[PDB]
Amino acid sequence: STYDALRRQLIPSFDLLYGSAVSVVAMSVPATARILDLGAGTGLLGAALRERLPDAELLLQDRSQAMLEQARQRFADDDQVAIRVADHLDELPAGPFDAVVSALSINHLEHQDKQDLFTRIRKILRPGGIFVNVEQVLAPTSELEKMYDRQHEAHVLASDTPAEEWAAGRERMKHDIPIDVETQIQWLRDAGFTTADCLAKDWRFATYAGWNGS
Numbered sequence: 332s333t334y335d336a337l338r339r340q341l342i343p344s345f346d347l348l349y350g351s352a353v354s355v356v357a358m359s360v361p362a363t364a365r366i367l368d369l370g371a372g373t374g375l376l377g378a379a380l381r382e383r384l385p386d387a388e389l390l391l392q393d394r395s396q397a398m399l400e401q402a403r404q405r406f407a408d409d410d411q412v413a414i415r416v417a418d419h420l421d422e423l424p425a426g427p428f429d430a431v432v433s434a435l436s437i438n439h440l441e442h443q444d445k446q447d448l449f450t451r452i453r454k455i456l457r458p459g460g461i462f463v464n465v466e467q468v469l470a471p472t473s474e475l476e477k478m479y480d481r482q483h484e485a486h487v488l489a490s491d492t493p494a495e496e497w498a499a500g501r502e503r504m505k506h507d508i509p510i511d512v513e514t515q516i517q518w519l520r521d522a523g524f525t526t527a528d529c530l531a532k533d534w535r536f537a538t539y540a541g542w543n544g545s
């Protein structure tokens with residue numbers, strides 16, 4: 332409620348970017364899809380997926396028990412949601428999966444571990460399966476990165492975000508290892524995804540996807 336409201340204040344085009352992730356999954360997988368949610372946190376993208384796909388099986392995983400406890404509370408009464416404590420770097424669940432989704436999590440990995448993860452994700456996707464990332468992305472240059480930062484700050488100020496939460500936000504972003512969206516899209520092609528695309532973008536934040544065969 333307050334947490335979800337705060338995420339909208341901190342994330343430019345939250346509805347467009349998380350909404351695009353939901354819409355592209357809904358147009359790519361069945362009603363009864365098996366979906367892996369990597370770095371699920373409180374399960375915010377999971378909640379948006381459940382609203383669109385009431386019959387989908389969600390497996391939420393994260394390295395943080397504390398974050399997954401928030402996801403457990405959110406989905407307390409949902410018998411089609413499982414929770415697994417697992418780092419991105421730990422062995423993935425067997426599969427197959429119709430979709431693997433992630434929001435604002437994969438940027439925390441070293442670049443080589445991102446490329447390895449994309450390869451490992453495709454292995455657990457059925458043919459026609461989709462990988463979707465709602466991601467913090469780096470500008471191609473230092474000058475454009477400053478412009479990305481100004482536009483992010485403009486949203487946070489316009490959204491009337493508490494100064495203490497924005498302060499906390501900037502501190503958490505120090506541990507992020509973002510790269511530009513086109514590099515990551517090319518990495519999906521390198522990983523053997525036949526199609527990769529940026530569906531939606533608001534400067535620093537982008538929704539991109541890869542398809543396993545289609």
Ligand SMILES: Nc1ncnc2c1ncn2[C@@H]1O[C@H](CSCC[C@H](N)C(=O)O)[C@@H](O)[C@H]1O
Pocket residue numbers: 338369370371372373374375376392393394395398417418419420433434435436437439440
């Ligand atoms: N190496 C790693 N393996 C697994 N989870 C990781 C991780 N590095 C970061 N995370 C998780 O990634 C999340 C980033 S915050 C995003 C949370 C949620 N997907 C949302 O959109 O709101 C946190 O829950 C953090 O614990």
